[PDB]
Structure formats: structure tokens, C-alpha cells
XYZ file of C-alpha atoms in Angstrom:
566
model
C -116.123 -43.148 -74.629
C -118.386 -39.908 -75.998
C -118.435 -37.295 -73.485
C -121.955 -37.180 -74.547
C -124.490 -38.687 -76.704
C -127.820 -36.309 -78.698
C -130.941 -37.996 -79.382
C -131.866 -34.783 -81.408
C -133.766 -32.932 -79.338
C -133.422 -29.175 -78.308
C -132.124 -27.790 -74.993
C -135.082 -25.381 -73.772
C -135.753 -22.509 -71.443
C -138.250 -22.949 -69.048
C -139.124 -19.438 -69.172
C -138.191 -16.203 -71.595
C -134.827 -15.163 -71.404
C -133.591 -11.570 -71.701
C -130.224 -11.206 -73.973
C -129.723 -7.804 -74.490
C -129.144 -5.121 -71.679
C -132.611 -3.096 -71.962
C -132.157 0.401 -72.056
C -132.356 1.530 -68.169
C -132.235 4.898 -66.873
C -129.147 4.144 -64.297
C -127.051 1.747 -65.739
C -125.772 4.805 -68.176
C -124.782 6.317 -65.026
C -122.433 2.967 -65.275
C -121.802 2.338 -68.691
C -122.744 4.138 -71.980
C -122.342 1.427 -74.700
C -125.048 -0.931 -74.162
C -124.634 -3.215 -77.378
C -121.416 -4.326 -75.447
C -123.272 -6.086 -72.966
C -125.283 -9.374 -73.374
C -126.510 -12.572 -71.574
C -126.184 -16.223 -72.853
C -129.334 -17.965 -73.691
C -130.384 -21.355 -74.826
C -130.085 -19.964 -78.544
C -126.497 -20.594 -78.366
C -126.801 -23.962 -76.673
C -126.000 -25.869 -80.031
C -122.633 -24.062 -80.425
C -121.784 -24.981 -76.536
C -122.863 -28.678 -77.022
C -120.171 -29.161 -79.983
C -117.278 -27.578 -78.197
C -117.975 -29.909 -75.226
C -118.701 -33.313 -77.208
C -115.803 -35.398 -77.728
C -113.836 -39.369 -77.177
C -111.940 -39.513 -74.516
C -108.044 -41.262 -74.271
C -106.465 -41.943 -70.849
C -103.551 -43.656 -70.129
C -102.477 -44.053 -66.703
C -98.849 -44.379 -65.190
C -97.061 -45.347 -62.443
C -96.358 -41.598 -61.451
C -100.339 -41.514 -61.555
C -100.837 -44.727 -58.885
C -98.137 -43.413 -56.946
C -100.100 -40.083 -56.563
C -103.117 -41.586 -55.930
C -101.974 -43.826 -53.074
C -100.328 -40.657 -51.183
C -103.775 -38.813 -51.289
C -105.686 -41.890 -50.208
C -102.811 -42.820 -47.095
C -104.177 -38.714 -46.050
C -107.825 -38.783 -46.503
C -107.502 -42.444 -44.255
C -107.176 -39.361 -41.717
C -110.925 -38.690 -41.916
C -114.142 -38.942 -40.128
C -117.214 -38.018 -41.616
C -120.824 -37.487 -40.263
C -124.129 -38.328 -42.165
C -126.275 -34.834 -41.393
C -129.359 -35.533 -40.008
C -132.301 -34.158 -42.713
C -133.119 -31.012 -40.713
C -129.117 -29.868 -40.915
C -129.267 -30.778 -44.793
C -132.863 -28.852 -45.708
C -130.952 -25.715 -43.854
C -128.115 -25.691 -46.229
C -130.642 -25.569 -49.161
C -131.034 -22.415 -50.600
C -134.679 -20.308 -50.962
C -134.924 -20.497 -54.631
C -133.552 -23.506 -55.315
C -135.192 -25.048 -57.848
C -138.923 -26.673 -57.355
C -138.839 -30.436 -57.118
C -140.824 -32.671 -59.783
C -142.624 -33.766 -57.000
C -144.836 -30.971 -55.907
C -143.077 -29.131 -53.190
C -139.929 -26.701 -52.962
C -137.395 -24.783 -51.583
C -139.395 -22.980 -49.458
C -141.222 -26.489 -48.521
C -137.886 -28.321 -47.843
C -136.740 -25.319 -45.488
C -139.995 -25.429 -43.369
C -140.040 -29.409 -43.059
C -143.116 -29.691 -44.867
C -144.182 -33.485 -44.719
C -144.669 -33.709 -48.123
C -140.588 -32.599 -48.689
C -139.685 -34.858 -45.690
C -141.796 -37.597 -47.045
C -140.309 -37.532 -50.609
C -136.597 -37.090 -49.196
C -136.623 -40.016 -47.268
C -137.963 -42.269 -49.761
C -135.537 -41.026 -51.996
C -132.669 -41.847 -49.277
C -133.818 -45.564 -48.823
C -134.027 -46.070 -52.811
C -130.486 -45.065 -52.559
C -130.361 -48.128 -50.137
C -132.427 -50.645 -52.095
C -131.286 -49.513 -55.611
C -127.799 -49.630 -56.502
C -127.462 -49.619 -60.222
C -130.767 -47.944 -61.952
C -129.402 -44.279 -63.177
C -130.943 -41.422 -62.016
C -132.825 -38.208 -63.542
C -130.876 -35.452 -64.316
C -132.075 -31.818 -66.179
C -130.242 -30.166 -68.737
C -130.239 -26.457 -69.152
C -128.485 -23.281 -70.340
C -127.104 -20.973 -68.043
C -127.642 -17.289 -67.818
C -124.580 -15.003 -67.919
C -123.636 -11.820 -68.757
C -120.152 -10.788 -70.253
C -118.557 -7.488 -72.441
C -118.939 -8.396 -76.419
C -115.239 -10.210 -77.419
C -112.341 -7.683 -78.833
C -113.428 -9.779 -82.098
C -116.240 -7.521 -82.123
C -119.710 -9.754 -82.298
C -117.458 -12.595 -80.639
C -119.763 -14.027 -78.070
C -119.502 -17.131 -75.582
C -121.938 -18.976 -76.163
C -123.851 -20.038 -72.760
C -122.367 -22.792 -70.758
C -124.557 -26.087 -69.519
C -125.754 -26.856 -66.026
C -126.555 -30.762 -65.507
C -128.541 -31.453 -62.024
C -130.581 -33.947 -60.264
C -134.126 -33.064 -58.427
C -134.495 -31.466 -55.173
C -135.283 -34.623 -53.294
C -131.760 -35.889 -54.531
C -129.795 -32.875 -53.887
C -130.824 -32.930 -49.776
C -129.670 -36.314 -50.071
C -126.441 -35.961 -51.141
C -125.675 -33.294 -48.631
C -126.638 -35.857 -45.806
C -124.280 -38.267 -47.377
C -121.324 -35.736 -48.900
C -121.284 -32.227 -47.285
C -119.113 -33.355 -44.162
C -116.990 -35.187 -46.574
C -116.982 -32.665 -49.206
C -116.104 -29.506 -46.110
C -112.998 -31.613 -45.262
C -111.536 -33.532 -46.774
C -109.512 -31.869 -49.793
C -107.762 -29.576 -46.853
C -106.782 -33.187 -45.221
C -105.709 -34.547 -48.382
C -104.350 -31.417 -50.105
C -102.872 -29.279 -47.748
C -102.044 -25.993 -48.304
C -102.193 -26.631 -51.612
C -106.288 -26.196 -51.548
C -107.479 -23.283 -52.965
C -110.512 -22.558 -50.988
C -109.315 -22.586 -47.392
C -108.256 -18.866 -48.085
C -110.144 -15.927 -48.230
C -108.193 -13.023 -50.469
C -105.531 -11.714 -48.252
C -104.381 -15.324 -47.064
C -103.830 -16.641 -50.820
C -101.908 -13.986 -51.657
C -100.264 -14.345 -48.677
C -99.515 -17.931 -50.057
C -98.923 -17.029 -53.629
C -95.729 -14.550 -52.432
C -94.264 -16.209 -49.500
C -94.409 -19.762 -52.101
C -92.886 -17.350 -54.935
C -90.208 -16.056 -52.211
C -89.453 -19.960 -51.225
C -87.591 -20.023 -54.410
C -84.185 -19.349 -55.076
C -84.783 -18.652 -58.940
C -88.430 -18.936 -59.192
C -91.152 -20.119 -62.269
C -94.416 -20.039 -62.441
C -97.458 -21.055 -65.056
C -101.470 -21.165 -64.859
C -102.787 -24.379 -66.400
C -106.435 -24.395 -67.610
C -107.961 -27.475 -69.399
C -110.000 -27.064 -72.293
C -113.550 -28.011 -70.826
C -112.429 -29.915 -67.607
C -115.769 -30.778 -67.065
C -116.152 -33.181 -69.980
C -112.324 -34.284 -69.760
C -113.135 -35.964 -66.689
C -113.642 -39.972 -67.527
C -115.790 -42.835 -66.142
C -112.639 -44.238 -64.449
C -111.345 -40.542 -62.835
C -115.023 -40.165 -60.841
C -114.148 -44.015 -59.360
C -111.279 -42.889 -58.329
C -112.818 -39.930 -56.647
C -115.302 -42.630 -54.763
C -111.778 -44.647 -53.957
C -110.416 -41.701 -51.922
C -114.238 -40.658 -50.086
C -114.420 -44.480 -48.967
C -111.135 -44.168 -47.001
C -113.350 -41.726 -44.728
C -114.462 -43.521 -41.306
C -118.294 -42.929 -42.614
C -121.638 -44.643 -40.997
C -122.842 -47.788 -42.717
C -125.758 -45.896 -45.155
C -123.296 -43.006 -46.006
C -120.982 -45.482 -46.890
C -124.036 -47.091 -49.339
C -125.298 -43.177 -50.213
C -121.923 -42.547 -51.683
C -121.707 -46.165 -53.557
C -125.157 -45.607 -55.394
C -124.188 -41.885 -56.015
C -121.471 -42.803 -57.476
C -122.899 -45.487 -59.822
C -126.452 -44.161 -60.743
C -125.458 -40.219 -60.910
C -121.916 -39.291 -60.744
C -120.763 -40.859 -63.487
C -122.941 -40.636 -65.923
C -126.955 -40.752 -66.621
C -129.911 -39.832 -69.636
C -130.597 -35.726 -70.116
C -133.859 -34.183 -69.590
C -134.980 -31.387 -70.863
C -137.142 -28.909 -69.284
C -140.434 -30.215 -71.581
C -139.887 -33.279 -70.094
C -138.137 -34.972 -73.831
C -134.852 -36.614 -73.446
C -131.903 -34.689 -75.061
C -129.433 -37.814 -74.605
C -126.901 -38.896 -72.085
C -123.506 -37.917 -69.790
C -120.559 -39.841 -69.001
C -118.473 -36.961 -67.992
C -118.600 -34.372 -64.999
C -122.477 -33.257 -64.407
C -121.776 -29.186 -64.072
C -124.384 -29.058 -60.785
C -123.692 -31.922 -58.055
C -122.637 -31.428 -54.561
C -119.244 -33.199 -55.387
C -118.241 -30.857 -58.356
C -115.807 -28.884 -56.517
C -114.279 -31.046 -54.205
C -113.958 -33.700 -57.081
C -112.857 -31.654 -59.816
C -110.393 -30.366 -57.023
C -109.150 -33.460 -55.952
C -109.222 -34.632 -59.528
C -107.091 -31.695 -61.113
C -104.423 -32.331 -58.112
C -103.717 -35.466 -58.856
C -103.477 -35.187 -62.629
C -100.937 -32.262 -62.117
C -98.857 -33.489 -59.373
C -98.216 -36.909 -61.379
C -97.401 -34.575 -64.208
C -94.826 -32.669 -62.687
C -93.307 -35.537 -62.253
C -93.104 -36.804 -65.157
C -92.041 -33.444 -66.553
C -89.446 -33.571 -63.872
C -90.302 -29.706 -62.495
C -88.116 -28.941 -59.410
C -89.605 -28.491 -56.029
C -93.083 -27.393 -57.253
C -95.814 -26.005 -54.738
C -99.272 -25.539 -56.738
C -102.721 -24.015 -55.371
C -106.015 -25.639 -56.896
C -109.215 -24.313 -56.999
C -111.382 -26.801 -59.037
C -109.898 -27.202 -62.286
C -107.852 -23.591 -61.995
C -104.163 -24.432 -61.330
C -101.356 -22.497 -60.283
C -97.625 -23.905 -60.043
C -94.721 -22.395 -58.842
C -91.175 -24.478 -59.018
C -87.345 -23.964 -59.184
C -86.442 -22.658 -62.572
C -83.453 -24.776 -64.302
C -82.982 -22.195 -67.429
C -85.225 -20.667 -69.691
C -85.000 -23.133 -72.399
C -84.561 -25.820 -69.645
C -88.265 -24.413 -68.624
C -89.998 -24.263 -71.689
C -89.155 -28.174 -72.810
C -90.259 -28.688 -69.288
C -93.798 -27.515 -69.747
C -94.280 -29.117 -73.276
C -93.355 -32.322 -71.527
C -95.910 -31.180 -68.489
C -98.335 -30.876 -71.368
C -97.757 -34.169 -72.429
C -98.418 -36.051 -69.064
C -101.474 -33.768 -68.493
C -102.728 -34.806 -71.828
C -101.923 -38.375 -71.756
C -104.092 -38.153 -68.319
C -106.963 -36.606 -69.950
C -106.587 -33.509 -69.789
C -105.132 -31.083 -72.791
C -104.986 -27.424 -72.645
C -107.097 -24.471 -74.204
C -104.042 -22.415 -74.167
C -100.922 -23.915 -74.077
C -98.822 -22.051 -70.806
C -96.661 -20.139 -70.619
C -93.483 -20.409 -68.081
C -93.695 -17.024 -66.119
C -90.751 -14.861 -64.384
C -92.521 -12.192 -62.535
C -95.749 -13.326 -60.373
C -97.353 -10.487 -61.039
C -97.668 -11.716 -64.592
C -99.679 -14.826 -63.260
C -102.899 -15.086 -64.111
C -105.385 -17.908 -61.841
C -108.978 -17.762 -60.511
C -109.029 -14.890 -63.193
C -106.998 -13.019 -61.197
C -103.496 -11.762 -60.309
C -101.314 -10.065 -57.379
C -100.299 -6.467 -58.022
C -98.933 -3.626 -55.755
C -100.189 -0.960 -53.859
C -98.828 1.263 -50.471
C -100.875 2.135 -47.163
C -100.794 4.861 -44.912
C -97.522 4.403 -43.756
C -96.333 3.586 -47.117
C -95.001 -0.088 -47.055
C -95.326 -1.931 -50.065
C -98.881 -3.933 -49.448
C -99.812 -6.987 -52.224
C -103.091 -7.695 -52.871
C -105.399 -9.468 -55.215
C -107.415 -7.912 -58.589
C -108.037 -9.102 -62.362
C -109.667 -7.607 -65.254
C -112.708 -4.924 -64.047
C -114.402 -5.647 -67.887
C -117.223 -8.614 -66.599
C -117.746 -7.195 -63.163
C -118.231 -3.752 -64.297
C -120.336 -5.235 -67.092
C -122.811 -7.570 -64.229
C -122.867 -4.730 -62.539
C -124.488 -2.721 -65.005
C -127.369 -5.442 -65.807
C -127.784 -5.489 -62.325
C -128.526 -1.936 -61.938
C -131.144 -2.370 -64.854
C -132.580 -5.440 -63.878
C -133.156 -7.295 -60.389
C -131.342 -10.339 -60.134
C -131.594 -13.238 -57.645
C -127.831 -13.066 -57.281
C -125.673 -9.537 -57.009
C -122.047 -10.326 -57.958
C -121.493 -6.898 -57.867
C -121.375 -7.104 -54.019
C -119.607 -10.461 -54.107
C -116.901 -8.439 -56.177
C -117.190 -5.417 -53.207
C -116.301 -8.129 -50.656
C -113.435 -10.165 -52.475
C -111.943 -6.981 -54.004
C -112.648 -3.920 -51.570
C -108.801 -2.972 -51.720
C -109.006 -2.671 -55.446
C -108.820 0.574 -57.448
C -111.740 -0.070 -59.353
C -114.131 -1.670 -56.894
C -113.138 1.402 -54.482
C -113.944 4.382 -57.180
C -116.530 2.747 -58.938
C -118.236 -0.493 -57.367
C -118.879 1.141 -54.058
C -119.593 4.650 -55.253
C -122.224 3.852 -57.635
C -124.089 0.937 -55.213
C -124.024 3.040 -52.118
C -125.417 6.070 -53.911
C -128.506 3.919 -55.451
C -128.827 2.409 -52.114
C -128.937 5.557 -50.907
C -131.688 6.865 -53.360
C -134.404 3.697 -52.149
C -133.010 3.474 -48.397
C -132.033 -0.499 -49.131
C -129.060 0.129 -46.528
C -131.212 -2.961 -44.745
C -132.138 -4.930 -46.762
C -130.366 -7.675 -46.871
C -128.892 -8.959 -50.296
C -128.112 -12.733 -51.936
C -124.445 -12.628 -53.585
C -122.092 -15.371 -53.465
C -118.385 -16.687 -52.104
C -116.974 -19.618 -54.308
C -120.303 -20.778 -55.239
C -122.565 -20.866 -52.038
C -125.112 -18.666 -51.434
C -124.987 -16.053 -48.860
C -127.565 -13.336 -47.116
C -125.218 -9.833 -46.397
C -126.274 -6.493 -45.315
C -124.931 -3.936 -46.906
C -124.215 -1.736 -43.990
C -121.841 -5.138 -42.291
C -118.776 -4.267 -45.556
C -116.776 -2.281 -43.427
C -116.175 -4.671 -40.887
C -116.286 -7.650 -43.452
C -113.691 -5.631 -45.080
C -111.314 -5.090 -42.456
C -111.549 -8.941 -41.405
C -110.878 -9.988 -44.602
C -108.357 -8.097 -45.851
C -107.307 -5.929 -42.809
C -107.443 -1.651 -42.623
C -104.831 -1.601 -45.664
C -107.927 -2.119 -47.736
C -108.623 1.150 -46.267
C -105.851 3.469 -46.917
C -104.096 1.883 -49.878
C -103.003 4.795 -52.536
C -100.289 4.225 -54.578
C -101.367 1.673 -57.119
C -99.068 0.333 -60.194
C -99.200 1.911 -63.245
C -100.308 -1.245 -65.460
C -102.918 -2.003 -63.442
C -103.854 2.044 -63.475
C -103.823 1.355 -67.250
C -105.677 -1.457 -67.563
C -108.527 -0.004 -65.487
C -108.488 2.577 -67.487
C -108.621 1.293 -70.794
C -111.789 -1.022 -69.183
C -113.236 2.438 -68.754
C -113.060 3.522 -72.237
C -114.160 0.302 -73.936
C -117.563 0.466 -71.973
C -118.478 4.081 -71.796
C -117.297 4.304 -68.136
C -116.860 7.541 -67.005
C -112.971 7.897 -66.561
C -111.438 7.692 -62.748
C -111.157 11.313 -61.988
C -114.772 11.532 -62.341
C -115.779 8.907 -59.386
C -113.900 11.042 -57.006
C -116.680 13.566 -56.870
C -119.951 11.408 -56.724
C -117.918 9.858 -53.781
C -117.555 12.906 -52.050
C -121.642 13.298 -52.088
C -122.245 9.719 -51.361
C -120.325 9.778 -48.240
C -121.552 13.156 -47.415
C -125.161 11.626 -47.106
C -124.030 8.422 -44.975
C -121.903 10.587 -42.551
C -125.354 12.436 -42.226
C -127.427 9.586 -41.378
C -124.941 7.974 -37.911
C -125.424 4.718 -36.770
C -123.995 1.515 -39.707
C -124.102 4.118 -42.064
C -122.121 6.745 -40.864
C -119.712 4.333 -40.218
C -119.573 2.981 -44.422
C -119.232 6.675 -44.948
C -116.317 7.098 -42.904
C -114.349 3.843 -43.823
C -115.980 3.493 -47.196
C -114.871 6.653 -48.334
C -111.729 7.787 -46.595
C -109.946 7.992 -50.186
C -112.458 10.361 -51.243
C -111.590 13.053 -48.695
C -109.502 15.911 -49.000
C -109.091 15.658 -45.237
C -108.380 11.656 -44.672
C -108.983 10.419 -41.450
C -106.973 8.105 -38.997
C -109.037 4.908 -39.022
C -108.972 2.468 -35.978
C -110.412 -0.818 -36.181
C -114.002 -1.584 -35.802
C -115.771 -2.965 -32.546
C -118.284 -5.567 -33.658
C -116.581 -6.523 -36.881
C -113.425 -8.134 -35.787
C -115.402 -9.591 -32.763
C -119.135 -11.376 -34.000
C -119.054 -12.163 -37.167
C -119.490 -15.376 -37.857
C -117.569 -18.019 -40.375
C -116.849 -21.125 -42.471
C -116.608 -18.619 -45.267
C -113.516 -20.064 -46.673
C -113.234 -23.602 -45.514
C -114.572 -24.908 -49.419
C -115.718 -24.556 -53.034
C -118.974 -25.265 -53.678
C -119.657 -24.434 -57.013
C -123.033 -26.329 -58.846
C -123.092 -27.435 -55.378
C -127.005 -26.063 -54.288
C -125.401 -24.107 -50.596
C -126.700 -21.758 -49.033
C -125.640 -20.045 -45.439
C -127.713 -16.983 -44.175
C -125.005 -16.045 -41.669
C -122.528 -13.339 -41.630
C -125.058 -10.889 -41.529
């Protein structure tokens, strides 16, 4: 079976797209070499299409149905509610996009009777209709990345596949209990997304100290999305119908599966049709939690069948992270060839082959890896970072250009104890901040794919929640990760480390001059900057009201959005 099928027709924009980073008067405070930033558009669509077109071969095994029947004897655990439609037009975010029906976000948020109208007739189709598929849009994603060290290499943009509006509240009534739950119930500790920062790394080195003679390896599938088969998303269904679920969730999830999930005809944004799917559509509620539960079960049948000792992994969607017993280095290697094997036998081949690792700081998952830093006291502190070249990179076109969606303060949040996000992310934001008095206003970024509202002026206490007061005070960072930072630096036209330290200085000299929230970023935000460090002591409201459900799941293509958490 074709991953997908072209009728010929092209993959449009709906509206022009911007490629190159235009030549602001700020971003240079960033970054100096321009022509090494870019953003996909639908001009490179064609190249994505063939990389992601392609038969499928699965062969199943008793390791496989083995697997399968232990995750379906846990999620038997479960009990899921249908959310009534006010609960699901909540969860839908602002700017989501318009439905084909005359009404949007903004209507569906407000209860307009022409959203509640459409959404309920689109529930009780779901009812009376079980086989016809349903509607999906095609379109190329915009992202920016750092030109490839093949100089003039460029990704070309990746695909997002999604139903209307109407269709997307329904699937929340139907799926968002189930999808919040139940891969924790089913996977353990082994999901991903139950951890903020500190708590997988946490994971990551306690797992890596559970071994006697530990070995470790990242897996990533070449385009999981359009590995996954016909017969992987009924599977998927198999294990959300062992949920205690109300009669027409129980029917929601049955024509879901049938009419969307698993395939359906392309749409353009002109309204042609580009072909159809029979693979993973990039922007359903259930991407996440499927690809999740899907990428689990592939893996843990293969370990078997590889014969890996003791192995713990952590999953996050179709990134995988395993850590087992070694049995001797060659011992390892034929292991992982055989681990290939399974994996690909299952549907699901590598882009890289791995790589059997002795030193978990050499592991790279999520795009990221543990290194080592001190605190004030000096006690060896781990922590989370990865590559600064496609933050620093957003961050620049984001300085340029105004963007729905800031990653540069997603990156803040889910790497404040980071060299880089410390000296440069912070710096630079808070003084521009500073310059327009946007201290208030609040801004979108987002947490493993959902949407969320944050004031700039809540980071120190989201910090020190997250990832404690080491995040705070941490000083003496390793030297390869020193290096690597710096050699970002120089590839971009960032001006080196040393330089930071004195913007800083200013920065926090105008917060501490202001009191109230921002005094307070000044004083926490900043502490490395000072000649004269401070004693920091934990902050009143933070670790008291704020609010959570920040890391309970992934919901990636998902269409979440949560305004909380100031």
C-alpha cells in the first residue's frame, strides 16, 4: 500500500510566504549573516512529497501480539469522559484555522450558534455515517532553520494534513480524555511527556545509574509519519476501545477511525484535490498519543527480538531513547543491527542507522542531551540542552518579524539553566521588551505542541518550579558544550559570549529600577551577570499559584490551546 497517491495537482499557499530573513534593524543585534537563515515554503513541497511517498511491508510476530496484549491488559485500567462542547470549544486555540463553513476560532470560543450548530451536526454524522471518508487539507508548513554545513543544503518544508474546524472540536469531545491518559496508564514511566525538563533528566540518569555496565542508543525512523500502516492505526483504535467510554464516544472513535484516521482524499487550499493518505495525517488530535503508543510497541517487540538485556526506553512520539545492560561491545553492535531488523520488519527503518552509546552524555533524543554544570554550593547539577543553531536562528526571525508563535520564549522556559539561553536568549528579549514596555503583554509560545498564553514577567517563578534555583546559580559548565556554543556563535555572526555579559549588566540595571515583577526578573534573571551575586531565596507566588497540566501529554498537530499559567 502507497503511503500516498498524486492526482497532479500542486500543493498551494493560501497566502504569500516570506523565505528569506528581511533585513531588520535588531535581528543584527542577534545575528550578522542573514543568508544563513530561511523559512520553508510550498516551493519546496515537491521535493518533501517524494521523500515521504513510498510501499509499505509489515510483517508481524509473535513478540509483536505479545506486546500488544500487555498494553491493552493496562489501558483496560481506563475511564474516559466525552467533554461536553463548551469544555472542547475552550481547548481550541484563537487562531485556529477558519472553518469552511463560515465561522471560526474566535466564533467556536464565544459559542456562536452558527459554530454550535455546525459542530453538532457534524457529531451526529459521526453517528449516522460510519464509512464515507472525510475532508482533509493539505499544506506546507512554515519553518525556519540555519542553511545546512553543505552550504545551500536546505530542508525542504514538511506537510501538515488536517480536518475542518467543526471536526477538530469533535474529536476533542470524543479523544482528549483518552488521549490526556492513557499512554501514562499504558506506558508508564516510560512516557515521554509526563516530565517537564528537570524530571526527565532526572529519569534519563537514575535509568543510566540502574545499570551495572550500561548502553544506550536514540532510534529515529525515517519519516514515521508515513511508516505508519492501515493495520498499525487499528491497532491504535484496539487499545482506545479497552477504555470504559460512553456509548457515542465509543461510536466517535469507530467512525474516526474509519473515515479519517486512516486514510482519506487531499485538498488543497484552491479547493482541487491533490490525491489521497493512507498513512499518519501530520495534524489530528491522536498524532501524539498514537504515534507514541505506536513507536512503543514497535520497539519493545524489537528488543526482544534483538534480545537487549533489561532495557528501560522513554518515548516521545516517534523519538526513542533506550538504555539496557551492555553484553560487550561487539556483543552490542550485532545487537542493534538485529534491533534494526525487527524495527524494520515492523515498518519502521531508520534514517540513520544507531549507534550503541557508552557515555549518556553522548545521547542525543528530543534533539537534546544531558550535560554538566555546578551551583552555588558547587555539587555537580545535570541538566538538559542541545544544539543553540535553530533556536538562536527563530529567534532572530522573530525579532524581525511578528510571529503568532515565539519559540524563543518556549526555549527560555524549557532551557533557562542553559548557557546559551542565559547569556543570550534572555539578554537580548528582556532588553527589546524593555525598549516597547511589552513586560505585560502576554505572549503565545508553546510546550510539546499546545498552545499557551505566558507573561513575560511570571519566568522567574516558572523557572524555579520547573527546574528549581540551580537554574539560577549554575556556573561551571563543560567544556564541549562551552565549545559547541561557541562555534554556534561564529557560524551565525553571534557576537561571542564575553560580549552578552555587558548588555546584561544594563538590562538588569533597568528592571532592578522599575520594582514590582520586574525588579524581581532583574534580580533572578540576571544574578550571573553581577559582579556582586546575590543569595537568592525562593519566590512567594511562584512555587504556590501557578497553575498545571503542563506536562501530563504531547499534543503535537493536535489544535490545544490552554491560557493558564499566566
Amino acid at each position: 500500500s502507497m503511503s500516498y497517491t498524486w492526482t497532479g495537482a500542486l500543493i498551494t499557499p493560501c497566502a504569500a510566504e516570506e523565505s528569506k530573513l528581511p533585513i531588520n534593524p535588531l535581528s543584527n543585534s542577534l545575528l550578522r549573516h542573514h543568508n544563513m537563515v530561511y523559512a520553508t515554503t510550498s516551493r519546496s513541497a515537491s521535493l518533501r512529497q517524494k521523500k515521504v511517498t513510498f510501499d509499505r511491508l509489515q510483517v508481524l510476530d509473535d513478540h509483536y501480539r505479545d506486546v500488544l496484549k500487555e498494553m491493552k491488559a493496562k489501558a483496560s485500567t481506563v475511564k474516559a469522559k466525552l467533554l461536553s462542547i463548551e469544555e472542547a470549544c475552550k481547548l481550541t486555540p484563537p487562531h485556529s484555522a477558519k472553518s469552511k463553513f463560515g465561522y471560526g476560532a474566535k466564533d467556536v470560543r464565544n459559542l456562536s450558534s452558527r459554530a454550535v450548530n455546525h459542530i453538532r451536526s457534524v457529531w451526529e454524522d459521526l453517528l449516522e455515517d460510519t464509512e464515507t471518508p472525510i475532508d482533509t487539507t493539505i499544506m506546507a508548513k512554515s519553518e525556519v532553520f540555519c542553511v545546512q554545513p553543505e552550504k545551500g543544503g536546505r530542508k525542504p518544508a514538511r506537510l501538515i494534513v488536517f480536518p475542518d474546524l467543526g471536526v477538530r472540536v469533535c474529536e476533542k469531545m470524543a479523544l482528549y480524555d483518552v488521549v490526556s491518559t492513557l499512554p501514562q496508564a499504558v506506558m508508564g514511566s516510560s512516557y515521554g511527556f509526563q516530565y517537564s525538563p528537570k524530571q526527565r533528566v532526572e529519569f534519563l540518569v537514575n535509568t543510566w545509574k540502574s545499570k551495572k555496565c550500561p548502553m544506550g542508543f536514540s532510534y529515529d525512523t525515517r519519516c514515521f509519519d508515513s511508516t505508519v500502516t492501515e493495520s498499525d492505526i487499528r491497532v491504535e483504535e484496539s487499545i482506545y476501545q479497552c477504555c470504559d467510554l460512553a456509548p457515542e464516544a465509543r461510536q466517535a472513535i469507530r467512525s474516526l477511525t474509519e473515515r479519517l484516521y486512516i486514510g482519506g482524499p487531499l485538498t488543497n487550499s484552491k479547493g482541487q484535490n491533490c490525491g489521497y493518505r493512507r498513512c499518519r495525517a501530520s495534524g489530528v488530535l491522536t498524532t501524539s498519543c498514537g504515534n507514541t503508543l505506536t513507536c512503543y510497541l514497535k520497539a519493545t517487540a524489537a528488543c526482544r527480538a534483538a534480545k537487549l538485556q533489561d532495557c528501560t526506553m522513554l518515548v516521545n512520539g516517534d523519538d526513542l531513547v533506550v538504555i539496557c545492560e551492555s553484553a560487550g561491545t561487539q556483543e552490542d553492535a550485532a545487537a542493534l543491527r538485529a534491533f534494526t531488523e525487527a524495527m524494520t520488519r515492523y515498518s519502521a527503518p531508520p534514517g540513520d542507522p544507531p549507534q550503541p552509546e557508552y557515555d549518556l552524555e553522548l545521547i542525543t533524543s528530543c534533539s537534546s542531551n544531558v550535560s554538566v554544570a555546578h551551583d552555588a554550593s558547587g555539587k555537580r547539577v545535570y541538566y538538559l540542552t542541545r544544539d543553540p543553531t535553530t533556536p538562536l536562528a527563530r529567534a532572530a526571525w522573530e525579532t524581525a518579524r511578528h510571529t503568532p508563535i515565539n519559540s524563543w520564549l518556549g526555549n527560555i522556559i524549557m532551557y533557562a539553566p542553559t548557557l546559551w539561553a542565559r547569556m543570550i536568549l534572555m539578554t537580548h528579549f528582556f532588553s527589546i521588551l524593555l525598549a516597547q514596555e511589552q513586560l505585560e503583554k502576554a505572549l503565545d509560545c508553546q510546550i510539546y505542541g499546545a498552545c499557551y498564553s505566558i507573561e513575560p514577567l511570571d519566568l522567574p517563578q516558572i523557572i524555579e518550579r520547573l527546574h528549581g534555583l540551580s537554574a539560577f546559580t549554575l556556573h561551571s559548565y563543560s567544556p564541549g558544550e562551552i565549545n559547541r556554543v561557541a562555534s554556534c556563535l561564529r557560524k551565525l555572526g553571534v557576537p561571542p559570549l564575553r560580549t552578552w555579559r555587558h548588555r546584561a549588566r544594563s538590562v538588569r540595571a533597568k528592571l532592578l529600577s522599575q520594582g514590582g515583577r520586574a525588579a524581581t526578573c532583574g534580580r533572578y534573571l540576571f544574578n550571573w551577570a553581577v559582579r556582586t551575586k546575590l543569595k537568592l531565596t525562593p519566590i512567594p507566588a511562584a512555587s504556590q499559584l501557578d497553575l498545571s497540566g503542563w506536562f501530563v501529554a504531547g499534543y503535537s498537530g493536535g489544535d490545544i490551546y490552554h491560557s493558564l499559567s499566566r
